[PDB]
Design a protein around this ligand. Structure first.
Ligand SMILES: O=[N+]([O-])c1ccc2[nH]nnc2c1
Ligand SMILES: O=[N+]([O-])c1ccc2[nH]nnc2c1
Ligand SMILES: O=[N+]([O-])c1ccc2[nH]nnc2c1
Ligand SMILES: C[As](C)(=O)[O-]
Ligand SMILES: [Zn+2]
Ligand SMILES: [Zn+2]
Ligand SMILES: [Zn+2]
Ligand SMILES: [Zn+2]
Length: 126
């Protein structure tokens, strides 16, 4: 059910954000092994997050819950942006482009931080 799905979703976002912060700490220290591991952990979690968000959006539409549909639409649009910067960042990390990678990590984290209040609103709205 929707609250069931949201209950699963609620805990994913902060685990993802913790990994991005861990990736930036590792990168700034030169620990390139660990950055790669973290990026690989993030691929699987971020895929789960997006699958769950899309599932919640579809269920909120089925229920005719206008304001959850709108909040989930914002969430999905922001996640799609992070997804593209993530793809860009892995490509930059593999190319050895430190300027591109550091810039994208910073931007990704800034986007992720902004999702926590939106998840809070989604909880109220469902
Ligand atoms: O990718 N992220 O950085 C990130 C941050 C917060 C989130 N909340 N829900 N999913 C999330 C993903
Ligand atoms: O981005 N937000 O954190 C956030 C929170 C509550 C909202 N209500 N409407 N748009 C919203 C966006
Ligand atoms: O309870 N709500 O349905 C609801 C709707 C829009 C919101 N924006 N921020 N928090 C919100 C809660
Ligand atoms: C109805 As609204 C998009 O201000 O939460
Ligand atoms: Zn239907
Ligand atoms: Zn809004
Ligand atoms: Zn609210
Ligand atoms: Zn609102």
């Amino acid at each position: 059910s929707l609250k069931e799905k949201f209950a699963e979703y609620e805990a994913i976002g902060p685990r993802i954000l913790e990994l991005w912060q861990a990736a930036r700490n590792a990168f700034e220290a030169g620990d390139l092994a660990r950055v790669a591991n973290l990026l690989a952990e993030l691929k699987e979690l971020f895929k789960k997050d997006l699958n769950l968000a899309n599932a919640m959006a579809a269920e909120a539409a089925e229920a005719g819950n206008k304001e959850a549909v709108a909040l989930l639409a914002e969430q999905l649009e922001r996640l799609k942006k992070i997804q593209a910067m993530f793809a860009a960042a892995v490509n930059a990390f593999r190319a050895g482009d430190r300027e591109a990678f550091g810039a994208l990590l910073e931007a990704i984290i800034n986007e992720g931080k902004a999702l926590l209040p939106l998840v809070e609103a989604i909880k109220e709205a469902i």
